[PDB]
Design a protein around this nucleic acid. Structure first.
Ligand SMILES: Cc1cn([C@H]2C=C[C@@H](COP(=O)(O)OP(=O)(O)OP(=O)(O)O)O2)c(=O)[nH]c1=O
Ligand SMILES: [Mg+2]
Ligand SMILES: [Mg+2]
Lengths: 555, 412
DNA sequence: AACGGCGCCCGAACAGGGACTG
DNA sequence: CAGTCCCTGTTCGGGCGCCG
């Protein structure tokens, strides 16, 4: 006979055709034994845990760690076998609240529900599926087995149930206090209002008593009444916010697991620290698949790490969101596919920062990557503030106009303005739209053998110029690129090039300025040196123009 | 007082589990206000996380409409109940709708809210309203009645819709009425005044039983087709003929009678691209023969109702957008071109969105299906902006392609 | 040694189309 | 025509950060 709590239960079923968990216990140290027998005894008197008998043919081990630098302990469990057989839940946690999205509030209070999962009941017909024994001695007393009447920690349905139950309890209070903002993340409650300090504490206690009607306690241990508030890993001040102090390790010998933790902290620090790069550091995590393997720092990876430490020396901070002012986002190019940005409303009062350094595609240009960075910032801004910021981009209006009107794919950037901060983003060469009168016409082609990997590449021109170059260890695609490269090398400033390679033409028409292929980069270098280049395509094996002539030489 | 029609998923398929995407502030506030009214009216109910199913939701405004409309992306749930609204309770497609002079589209989705939904199927209509900056967890609802945007809604309501439209059809036997999704397609050969008058009579016929006041007018008899055309120049260069032979060779995949023998003979040698080449007597003959084949229809091209429709779109530049609708490759059922749509010369995504909506509307009128689109755009670009310009109560399937134009096939 | 959420940078596995070979 | 290859794309799961 256990009392039913005021919180409504969540009907939890299991996947059909499967039973409950039947896993043997794990032998642990005697320190964990004297740290769990007292918990099951206290939770039994409080109704959070009931005792069972032989009519419950289930079992589950119960390993446990401590709490982070605190006196108490955290009783954990191993429901990994129960989670495989428990029904799937739809998570209602859709993201993480960011302090840059918080608005200005005169009074701020951060609550913390003590015993979060232990204050929400479990489904009545589901309590039988949570069985676990507690041996008082490591190898003497068999120990009486108990069950769970609340939400156990470690079950995959516990977070979703608590977050949904907490919302239903706060709904009547929010309807009675519309002007009060309550950021609800797990059990921590961020309460803000523009009321006076005295009237704010009154509504806080009204909320504390409202939650107490459902057995939710908000003790004064983790009750925050004055800044700076530690909320979501940040330091909230009345007019600014900053990230809690980030410590970067400084080891004399760097391994693989050390760099993974280093880049992770730099990604977390790049939300308010402008100019953080992780290109050369993450480059060391390629190929090597041994977390305990020492890796020497590259000269480029050492200078990158040195510049990130100097940025973290000067303390930085972000401001809060003001809906009455516009949202501005400014992007800068850091080179080598690295982009950094700042989102603000007033000049030099950053809400947050960030970076975009993803390299997608074997061949690309700065205009494509700037477009991708704009999309990343747009979606991130809709999550945090629910609107798109006005962009300030280091690309000329005329440059952008040339790219998007001439590209074959649909592409677009939202309302933006040009900002003159080098290095400016531009297109490094422009293919002609019509053939060039007076320029030599190069008919290029390349063929390779699938078996021997041998091939040839060359050209013939209208002036009688001709070349055939034998190639070893190549493909048909590489020889077609090589044929175009030869024509660019051996021509003047203006040249017409006729190819039958859809592969090569598609790469070059997209005006790439960078590539994972040394050959494409060499082709790009030649295209920049030229004054006029016209690429034309013809179908192969049709006796068309000089393409039939050069096809005989290379094949 | 109405027995719920039992609905079951296709055998071997689970319900939709699609994550909600971020919504703008104005869309969230609109959905909160709409869902609060629907919850007060019993149309929807709040649910918990024990429902593992979820469908994305957002909001749109129709053309020249200032009123927000709730739109659920039931694309995943629809193809998981395909044997219901196509096999069990299907709607016949009238072949005369495309022949009518004027076709008006009427939103009748609100009528579905009066018919309850099967209790065992309500869990598959779950959707989640997000919050800005994740201030609060997701607010989950599920439908208690026939939801808008679900293909099972017009199928179950078809019996109710037929009895409502039965007196009007007897009064006007020459009017063709087709129902697709939340819409009603009404076509007639009457004059513009007589047509709109009969449309208003049909509106009053539905009133005696929040977007019924709107009427989007179509004219399928004015819908044009874009054939493959060849350039006509006074003088021809080596480059002009190389492009012409390249276009005719690709066109041979559609018309097997196109020849390029006499034209390729003009390019004998290794000539400069700008060298003018006069067309021979046989070249004029072969080029004139190829221009007539492009006017002749393609052999063995007809609609198969069992096959899906595919739509390809090409960005031609300067507000020009060509498209082709087919079921088998090179067997185009329709080819067309759009020009000077909204967003022309400034916004590719709005134009592409407009083009997709126009092509889908034509496909509903002509065949009664929505095609799967091959969109000439990056996935991340389309998924960032497309909802900002969507003005339709349905959503077609789409995929993303990247095909550089080796030869301008549909627009010189 | 647990659960859930989001972000990054990583690699392996898989899909898809031009082009050559039997 | 099949069956490969070459090349490029997406998907996914895990590494790390962070929250609870
Ligand atoms: C930090 C943490 C948390 N949780 C779950 C459990 C309760 C809520 C909040 O945890 P908590 O606030 O730190 O501890 P709690 O149970 O509330 O007890 P108190 O320390 O607040 O009194 O999230 C978890 O499952 N694993 C974790 O590592
Ligand atoms: Mg707590
Ligand atoms: Mg070739």
């Amino acid at each position: 006979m256990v009392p039913i709590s005021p919180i409504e239960t969540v009907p939890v079923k299991l996947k059909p055709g499967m039973d409950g968990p039947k896993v043997k216990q794990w032998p642990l140290t005697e320190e964990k034994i004297k740290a769990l027998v007292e918990i099951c005894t206290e939770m039994e008197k409080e109704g959070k845990i009931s005792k069972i008998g032989p009519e419950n043919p289930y079992n589950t081990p119960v390993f446990a760690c401590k709490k982070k630098d605190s006196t108490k302990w955290r009783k954990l469990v191993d429901f990994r076998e129960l989670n495989k057989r428990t029904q799937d839940f739809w998570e209602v946690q859709l993201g993480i609240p960011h302090p840059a999205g918080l608005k200005k509030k005169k009074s701020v209070t951060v609550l913390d529900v003590g015993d979060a999962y232990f204050s929400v009941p479990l489904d009545e017909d589901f309590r039988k599926y949570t069985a676990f024994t507690i041996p008082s001695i490591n190898n003497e007393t068999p120990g009486i087995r108990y069950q769970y009447n609340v939400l156990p920690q470690g079950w995959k349905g516990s977070p979703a149930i608590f977050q949904s139950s907490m919302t239903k309890i706060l709904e009547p209070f929010k309807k009675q206090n519309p002007d009060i903002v309550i950021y609800q993340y797990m059990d921590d409650l961020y309460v803000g209002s523009d009321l006076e300090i005295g009237q704010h504490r009154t509504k806080i206690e009204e909320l504390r008593q409202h939650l107490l009607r459902w057995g939710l306690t908000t003790p004064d241990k983790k009750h925050q009444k004055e800044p700076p508030f530690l909320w979501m890993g940040y330091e909230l001040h009345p007019d600014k916010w900053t990230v809690q102090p980030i410590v970067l390790p400084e080891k004399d010998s760097w391994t693989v697991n050390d760099i993974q933790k280093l880049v992770g902290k730099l990604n977390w620090a790049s939300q308010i620290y402008p100019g953080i790069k992780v290109r050369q550091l993450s480059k060391l995590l390629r190929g090597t698949k041994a977390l305990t393997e020492v890796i020497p720092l590259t000269e480029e990876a050492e200078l990158e790490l040195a510049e990130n430490r100097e940025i973290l020396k000067e303390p930085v901070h972000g401001v809060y969101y003001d809906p009455s002012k516009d949202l501005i986002a400014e992007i800068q190019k850091q080179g080598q596919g690295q982009w950094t940005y700042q989102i603000y409303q007033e000049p030099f009062k950053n809400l947050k920062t960030g970076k975009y350094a993803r390299m997608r595609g074997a061949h690309t240009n700065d205009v494509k990557q700037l477009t991708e960075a704009v999309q990343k910032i747009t979606t991130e801004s809709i999550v945090i503030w629910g609107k798109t910021p006005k962009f300030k981009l280091p690309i000329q209006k005329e440059t952008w106009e040339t790219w998007w009107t001439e590209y074959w794919q649909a592409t677009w950037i939202p309302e933006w303005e040009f900002v003159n901060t080098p290095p400016l983003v531009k297109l490094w060469y422009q293919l002609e739209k019509e053939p060039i009168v007076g320029a030599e016409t190069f008919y290029v082609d390349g063929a390779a053998n699938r078996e021997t990997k041998l091939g040839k590449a060359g050209y013939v021109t209208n002036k009688g110029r001709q070349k055939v170059v034998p190639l070893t260890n190549t493909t048909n695609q590489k020889t077609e690129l090589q044929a175009i490269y030869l024509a660019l090398q051996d021509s003047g400033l203006e040249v017409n090039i006729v190819t039958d390679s859809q592969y090569a033409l598609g790469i070059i028409q997209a005006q790439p300025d960078k590539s994972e292929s040394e050959l494409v980069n060499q082709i790009i270098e030649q295209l920049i040196k030229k004054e006029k280049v016209y690429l034309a395509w013809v179908p192969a094996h049709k006796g068309i123009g000089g393409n039939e002539q050069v096809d005989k030489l290379v094949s | 007082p109405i027995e719920t029609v039992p609905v079951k998923l296709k055998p071997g398929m689970d319900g939709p589990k699609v994550k909600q995407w971020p919504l703008t502030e104005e869309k969230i506030k609109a959905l909160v206000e709409i869902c609060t009214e629907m919850e007060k009216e019993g149309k929807i109910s709040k649910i918990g996380p024990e429902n593992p199913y979820n469908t994305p939701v957002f909001a749109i405004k129709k053309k020249d409409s200032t009123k927000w409309r709730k739109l659920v992306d039931f694309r995943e749930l629809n193809k998981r109940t395909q044997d219901f609204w196509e096999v069990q309770l299907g709607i016949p497609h009238p072949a005369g709708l495309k022949k009518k002079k004027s076709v008006t589209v009427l939103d009748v989705g609100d009528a579905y809210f009066s018919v309850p939904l099967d209790e065992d199927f309500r869990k598959y209509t779950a959707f989640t309203i997000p919050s800005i900056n994740n201030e609060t967890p997701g607010i989950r609802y599920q439908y208690n009645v026939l939801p808008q945007g679900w293909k099972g809604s017009p199928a179950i309501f078809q019996s109710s819709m037929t009895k409502i439209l039965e007196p009007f059809k007897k009064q006007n036997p020459d009017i063709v009425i087709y129902q697709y999704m939340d819409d009603l397609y009404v076509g007639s050969d009457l004059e513009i005044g007589q047509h709109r008058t009969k449309i208003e009579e049909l509106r009053q016929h539905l009133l005696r039983w929040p977007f019924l006041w709107m009427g989007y007018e179509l004219h399928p008899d004015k819908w044009t087709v874009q054939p493959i055309v060849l350039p006509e120049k006074d003088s021809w260069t080596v480059n002009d003929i190389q492009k012409l032979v390249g276009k005719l060779n690709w066109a041979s995949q559609i018309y097997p009678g196109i020849k390029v023998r006499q034209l390729s003979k003009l390019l004998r040698g290794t000539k400069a691209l700008t060298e003018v080449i006069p067309l021979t007597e046989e070249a004029e003959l072969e080029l004139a023969e190829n221009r007539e084949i492009l006017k002749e229809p393609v052999h063995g091209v007809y609609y198969d109702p069992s096959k899906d429709l595919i739509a390809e779109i090409q960005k031609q530049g300067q507000g020009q957008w060509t498209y082709q609708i087919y079921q088998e490759p090179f067997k185009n059922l329709k080819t067309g071109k759009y020009a000077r749509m909204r967003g022309a010369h400034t916004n590719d995504v709005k134009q592409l969105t407009e083009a997709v909506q126009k092509i889908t509307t034509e496909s509903i009128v002509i065949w009664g299906k929505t095609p799967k689109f091959k969109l000439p755009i990056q996935k991340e670009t389309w998924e960032t902006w497309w909802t900002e310009y969507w003005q339709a109560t349905w959503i077609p399937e789409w995929e993303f392609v990247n095909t550089p134009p080796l030869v301008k096939l549909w627009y010189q």
